[PDB]
Design a protein around this ligand. Structure first.
Ligand SMILES: CC(C)c1ccc2c(c1)sc1nncn12
Lengths: 198, 194
């Protein structure tokens, strides 16, 4: 079920594809980024073609579309990280067991930002030895969500008398969400890597 | 593509099906257990029919069959747990975030005797103990150590091409640890007593 606009990979399981400015695909990501980080400049945007991460993510999405019936389960969010993590995330995606304690913690999980400006902080997108900062644009299965709490290792139950029927994610604020936390593998697909500088 | 031996679910996605004592599937699973736990009394064996856990596991199985270029990635192991964790496992499988001497993942035993210790299959009020029979994608494995968050790389030259699991002993393993969701399918739950 590999998407048809992807480059042919030739029995290869993984590829980074450099986007060209002037293409809609580049321009949409640049605009989404510059909306809140117009003081930074983009070096490049690579499309992540990871067949295994894509398949496992698309199965979880189909399962959430079935379970939630007629919700928008998928959001496009940002994740800033250090240069040393980029190879791991490219191949293996987002791993809660590697995740940093956020400065405002709404659970022990992987954090995603609504605004590029949050991910562009040096604490998340740590500038490398050449001043390159790195930020992923991520399809994230936010599903049905609630306000989190620092102690969560999984999302909380919707109903305390049914402890195993869970929210899909948590947020900082249900009325104006600016971040989301997810507690399961293959709930996030890293779609694009933005490399940028001051 | 839900397996032959599963029974009809009336368009449901989860159910626990109690096995008929003395029939083939029950005898197969009983024998695996009694090989090392013949002093314990089996009260029941339930088949876990979780369509979503099964789909996610099968996808990861096919990926590891392609990755490793052979089809010997799967082992049938035991997991003992407390009664308060059984409903989560039936619905969501194994979660590393819930000793951890060989790394921070989920532990599976080769022998039911290991999982039958009270420290894993904790007796509830009436002395009932709980053990899963689990399909585990052990794949290519290496010796683990404390504080692993994923398995090590096969070559430190290529740090993202990892082992699939770790063990206590590569030559004669008695336990495996997996660090990813959907590398284990809980296939049968054994309710038993000392
Ligand atoms: C001593 C330690 C490595 C260990 C920890 C947990 C565990 C086992 C062994 S065997 C088993 N079956 N279910 C759980 N566990």
């Amino acid at each position: 079920n590999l998407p048809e606009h992807w480059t042919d990979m030739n029995h290869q399981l993984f590829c980074m594809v450099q986007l060209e400015p002037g293409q809609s695909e580049y321009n949409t990501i640049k605009d989404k980024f510059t909306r809140t980080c117009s003081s930074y400049a983009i070096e490049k945007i690579e499309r992540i073609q990871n067949a295994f991460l894509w398949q496992s993510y698309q199965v979880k999405k189909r399962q959430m579309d079935i379970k939630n019936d007629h919700k928008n389960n998928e959001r496009l969010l940002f994740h800033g990280t250090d240069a040393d993590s980029v190879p791991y995330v490219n191949q293996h995606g987002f791993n809660r067991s590697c995740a940093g304690k956020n400065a405002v913690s709404y659970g022990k999980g992987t954090y995603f930002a609504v605004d590029a400006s949050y991910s562009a902080k040096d604490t998340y997108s740590k500038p490398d030895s050449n001043g390159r900062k790195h930020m992923y644009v991520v399809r994230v299965l936010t599903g049905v969500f609630t306000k989190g709490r620092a102690g969560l290792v999984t999302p909380p139950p919707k109903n305390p008398h049914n402890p195993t029927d869970l929210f899909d994610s948590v947020t900082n604020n249900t009325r104006s969400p600016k971040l989301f936390v997810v507690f399961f593998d293959n709930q996030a697909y890293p779609e694009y890597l933005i490399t940028f500088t001051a």
